[PDB]
């Protein structure tokens, strides 16, 4: 009955590491925005003080250390991995590719459109939504890998 279970396990192990890395990075971005906004003792979680428009822009778009472009390339890598692992459900891949879009607005980068002049609370919720979309994508790929 089982022959290429090695395919299932190997492909599913690659996906998990990539999904976990991306979510860990997003958790760091949420914490960096919270810490920039408030202080070193800042709690990422709900009902947080000092909403600021500058924290997300500093953390994501700073010219020396900005993480926006890094985040974009990491989501792209993950979305491309999801595409190679999926079956032939365009309609399902088309759903996840839409959740993981990297498209901005006009002559601006995806990172600029999303984090230019954006409140800390809105930036953290946007990042939380991105993690939940990564986790949804992961679950759908896993189901597809089992056949």
């Amino acid at each position, epitope marked *: 009955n089982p022959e290429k279970v090695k395919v299932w396990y190997e492909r599913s192990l690659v996906l998990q590491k990539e999904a976990d890395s991306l979510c860990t990075f997003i*958790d*760091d971005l949420k*914490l*960096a925005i919270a810490r920039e906004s408030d202080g070193k003792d800042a709690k990422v979680n709900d009902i947080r003080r000092k909403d600021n428009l500058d924290a997300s822009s500093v953390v994501m778009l700073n010219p020396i250390n900005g993480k926006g472009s890094t985040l974009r390339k990491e989501v792209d890598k993950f979305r491309e991995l999801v595409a190679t692992l999926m079956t032939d459900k365009a309609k399902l891949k088309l759903i996840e590719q839409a959740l993981n879009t990297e498209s901005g607005t006009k002559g601006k980068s995806w990172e600029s459109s999303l984090f230019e002049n954006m409140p800390t609370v809105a930036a953290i919720t946007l990042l939380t939504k991105l993690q939940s979309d990564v986790r949804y994508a992961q679950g759908e790929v896993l189901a597809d890998l089992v056949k």
Partner: nanobody
Amino acid sequence: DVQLVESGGGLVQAGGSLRVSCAASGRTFSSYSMGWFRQAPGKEREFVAAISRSDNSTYYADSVKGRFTISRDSAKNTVYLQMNSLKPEDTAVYYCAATPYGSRYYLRELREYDYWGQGTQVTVS
């Protein structure tokens, strides 16, 4: 507040090996990644190696890559930096640090490390 204790520094000749440890307190290992930084004579401190708590991934400076190994023991709340093929350039003050971050994009950044230890002077001759 978090507290780190350091022990294992020594004097060794070229091509020799050593092992430095760092003591951790409480559940800090679960919430914080552990990093190790060395400060060369008359120079600014630089990152050596880091241990991620999230993925338990290891990160190394390209100058110490292949010679140095970072380890984690959850029960002992201790981190080990195994230093092999030691060169005189490795002579420095080795410092302990904890960061709330867990990804590769933050673990190499000295500024992202909240807590520090005194360290031990390691000499290679």
